[model samples]
Target: SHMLRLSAPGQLDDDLCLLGDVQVPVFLLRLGEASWALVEGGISRDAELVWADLCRWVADPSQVHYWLITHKHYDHCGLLPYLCPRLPNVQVLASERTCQAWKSESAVRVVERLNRQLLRAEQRLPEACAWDALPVRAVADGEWLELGPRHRLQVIEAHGHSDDHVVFYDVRRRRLFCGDALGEFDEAEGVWRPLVFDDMEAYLESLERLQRLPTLLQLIPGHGGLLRGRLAADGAESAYTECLRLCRRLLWRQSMGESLDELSEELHRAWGGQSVDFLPGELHLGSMRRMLEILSRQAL
Candidate 1:
C-alpha cells in the first residue's frame, strides 16, 4: 500500500484518500488507472471547497465518473447538483426510496428554503437549484460492487437512521463506511451517542450485524473521525454492547413496575454524576420514550 502525500489541510486524495470534512469520512478510490469513484460525498457546506479540491485532483472535470449518494441527507448528496454541469457523465447511485424523496412535496420545500439560505450565505449556486438527475441507478441491499481487481464493496441495508440508509463495506480493506448508521461522536466527551433513529429494534439488530463482522479493522462513521487500532475496536464494541445492556436493564426495571419519573431520575443520577454530558433533554426524552415503549411490549 502506497500513501501519496498532499498539501491539503483537511483530507489527502492523491490517487485515493479519505476526505474528512466534518463528521463523515468520504472515501475517494482510484480505479483502473484514472477512473475515480467517491463513496459518500460530504455535505452542502463543503460543496465549494470540495469541488475546488476535486477539480484540482482530477485536473479535468470529465475524468470524474461516479458520485455515489448513499442516502438523501444533505450532508451526503449536497454537492451533486453543483457538480453536475462541470463533471458531466457523473453517475449518481442511491436507494429507490431516497430518490423518490426528491419528488416529494417536502423535498421541494426543502430545496427552495436551502436555496434561499445558500444565496444569503453568498454561496455560489442558482436560486432555482434542484438536484439534477445524474443518470441515477437504484442500489439494493446485499449488492456487491466490483471496483477493479482485489477490491469489492458490499451494500448493507441497515435502516434506522432512515428507512433506506445503507452502509458500504469494502471487502479488501475490511472497512465499513457507515453513513449515520452508527450515529454521532462527541469529540469533547470522547463518546458515541445514538441519533434519533426511527426504529429502536431495527437499529439494535443493525448493531448486532456490525458486531458479527469477521474483519472490521476500521469503522468510518458519518459523523466522526476514523476509528482504528485499539481505540477503534474497543470503542465500537463497547458502544454497541453498552447500548444494548442499558436498554435491557431499563426495560427490566420498567417491567418490574418502575415509574417513568423514577426511571428518569435513576438514569439522571447514574449519568449526571459523570463528568461527561449526556445528550440534550429532547434527545434523551426520545430514547426514554422508546425504551418505555419497548418495555411495554416486552412486558405483555
Candidate 2:
C-alpha cells in the first residue's frame, strides 16, 4: 500500500487538515508510480489556486487520472466545469443521482451563480462555457475500479447527507474515503454532527453499513483531513452509534412535545458548548425537521 499524504495546502489540526479558505479537505492517493487520484474538488472560489497547488504536488497535471467526487454539493463539485476542461483526460466519477443532479435546473442555476461569484472573487472574467459543459460518469455500488496494478477502489453507495452521495474504499489499504455520509467531524468539540439533508432513514442506514466495514485502517472524511489510531477506530463504528443515539433521543423528545430549538440547545450543551461548529444550529434544526418529516411519513 502506498503511503497517503496531504498534497494540498491547508491548516492542520490534530491529524485533520482543512484545505483552502473554504476548508475543503483534499487527499492524494498514489495510484501506481506516477498516477494519483483526488478525492474532492474544493469550492470554486478557490479552485484555481487549489488546482495550481495540486499541479505542484503531481509535478505534472496529467498525472491525475481520477477525480472521485463524494456528492453534488457546490462546495464539493463547484469547480467541475472549470476542472474538466483543464484535466482533459481525467475521468470524473460520481453516483448516478449526482450526474442527474448536475443537469437539473436548480443545480445549473446555483453552479452558474457560484462560478460567477468565484470569478469576481478572483478578479477574472467569466468563462463562456456553461456549468453543464463538463461530463460525469455514473459509478454504481459494488463496482471495482483499478487504480493501478494490485491497487483498486470499491465504490459503495453511501447516500445519506445527500441522495447522490457515494464513498470509496481502497481494497489494498482498507482506507475508507467517506465523504459527508459519515457526517462532518468537529475537531474542536470531538463530535460528529449528522447532516442528513436527503433522508434520515438512508443516512442512518449508510452509517450502519459503514460501521460494518472490516479492518478500516483510516477514515478519510470529506471536510476533515483524516482520522487514525483510536479516533479512526472509534470513527468506524462508535461515532455512527452516537449519531444514531442522538437522533433517536431527539425523535423521542419531539414525540414528548419538545421543541427543535430546545433539543438543539440541549445537544449543543451536551457536545461541549461553543465548540460545535461543523453544523450550525439552524442547519441542525433543519435536518431535525427533515428527519421528523421522514419519520412521520414512515408511520403512515
Candidate 3:
C-alpha cells in the first residue's frame, strides 16, 4: 500500500506550517516498496529542522529517489542548496523556468536575504549556505514519472502563481500536489485566493485545465493541509470557480477605473475583517496591477 505523510508541519495554524518565518507545507509520498518523493522543500532557515524531521520519517534517507520542486519561490526551494548536496543521487525535477530562476544570482541573493531575516527574527545563529545553481532536470507538461510498478505521477505545468510553478498528479492515487498554482485556502473565511503574481490569464487557464482533471480525490496544497472527501471533490471545483469569478470581478472593477489599492481595499472589506496577510499584501496588489496591465495591452 502507498502512503502519504506530512513530514514537517512547520509553524502557523494546524493547516499551515512555517519554514522559519515563511509559511510552507511539505509532504512526503511513499510509492510501492522503496521509492520515496518529497513534495516541497522548506525554507533555508529551517533546513536543518526539515532535514531532521524527514530523517525521522523515513527509515533510510538514501531511499529518497526524487525531489519534486513545485516552483521557484524562495520558501519552496530555499532548502535545495542544502538538500541537493546531501541527497547525492536523488533526481531534482522542476520546470525550465524554475531552473533559470535558481541560476539567477539576483534571485538567489533575494532568498539569502530572506533567510537571514528569518534567522535573525528567531534569534538563531546565522549560518549562510551557498545558493549556487544546482543541477535540475526540466520537466514538461504531461511528462509521466513512474514511481514504481503501480504508481506514476504526471507533471502538469501550472504557472501564474509563479512562472515556474508546476503541480503533480498521481494517476493511481488521483491526488494533485498543487503548489501555489491553485493558491492558498483561507480556512477561516472558507475561500481560496488564487495568487496569480505573474500572469492572470495564465492562472485562469491553468485552473480551467486543473478543473478538467480526471478523478482528483485529494488535493495537497503548498501552504495548507491536504483536502479530501467533499473538499477534494466538489468543494475543490467550487474553489476554482470562485477564484475565477473573483478574478473576473476584479478585472471588471479595474475596467471601471478602480485602482489596485482600491480593489484590494474592497477585497479586504468583502472578506469581513479577514486579514489578507495569508499571502504578502504586496503580492496581491502586484498581481492585480499585472492583470490590469495585461487587460490594457489587449485593448490596444
Best by TM-score: 2
Across residues 49-145, which tens digit of lDDT does each residue of candidate 2 receive? 6666666556776777888888887667866776667766688888888888777889778655654544544255324345555656788988988
Model 2 ranges with Cα > 4 A deviation: 1-22, 112-129, 261-300
- Model 1 vs truth, CA RMSD: 6.0
The CA lDDT at 195 in model 1 is: 43
Q: Rank the candidates by TM-score, best first.
A: 2, 3, 1
Q: What's the lDDT for residue 287 in model 1? A: 52
Candidate 3's error at 143, in angstroms? 0.9
- Candidate 2 colliding pairs: none
Candidate 2 lDDT at 245 equals 68
TM-score of predicted model 1? 0.73
| Candidate 1 global lDDT | 0.60
Which digits, one per residue and each the tens of the lDDT, describe model 1 over residues 1-300? Answer: 112112123443233566545344456667656677777855444556666666655666676667666667655666666656666656767778777766676874664454334333556562223554455777888888765565578888877666767887876776777776765554545565554246666766777787776557666666545666554455446556655655667677867888666766655454433212212344355454555455445444
Per-residue accuracy of model 3 over 213-293 as CA lDDT, tens digit each: 886777777765666665666544666676667667766877798766677656544542332433344544555556545
